[PDB]
Amino acid sequence: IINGEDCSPHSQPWQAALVMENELFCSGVLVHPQWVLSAAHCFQNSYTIGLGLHSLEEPGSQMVEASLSVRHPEYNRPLLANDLMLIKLDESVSESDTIRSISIASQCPTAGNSCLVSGWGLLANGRMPTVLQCVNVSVVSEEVCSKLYDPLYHPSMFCAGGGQDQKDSCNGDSGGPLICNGYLQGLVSFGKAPCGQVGVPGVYTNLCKFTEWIEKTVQA
């Protein structure tokens, strides 16, 4: 997260850390007691998932195994598009004060929506934080996203950020949540390199387009 701050502890209780050999490579989002959304580009054959965390280095936190996951069937067709997967935890987690699922937005993004993105990806100073970071970003129009991310803009994507304040997601934030008006709207997916350029929003998986696929998978 570029130009954010430490989140208030446990204020994003759906945040999931995806780690391999105790090293973070992505985040995810707890959407039901047994289900974590993440970016399809975070796919692995198995996962250790940190829940209820603030630091990666805390009563109620859990490390859980997940042995099953499924990428959206059209991931990367076309390139970078449809960037979501569902991870099924090997055991359901009983909701607690610090581990809680978040609902997916019933509305699709529109310009001006106010959002929050969180994660343990790179900071503005190029370091990896130990404490979960949070920053505010606003949705921009589809036409802005299309123009900026020509030739690869696809309706499975939307853009948020791009202010002169240089607030953005960055490497290591993929799969983590973008909460707009209090609902899960997007997952961190991709953006321009470098992250945090003036005027340049990041790109997020457009979850309102996938609620049927997500819930059909959950219920199967």
């Binding site: 970016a39 580009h41 990367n76 390139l79 970078l80 960037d83 990806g121 991310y149 690869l152 997601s169 960055c170 490497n171 290591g172 934030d173 993929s174 961190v188 997916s189 991709f190 953006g191 321009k192 390199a193 992250c195 990041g202 790109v203």
Partner: peptide
């Protein structure tokens, strides 16, 4: 270019 936050597109 663009990069997943990984595949990059050169542009």
């Amino acid at each position: 270019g663009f990069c997943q936050r990984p595949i990059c597109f050169p542009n």
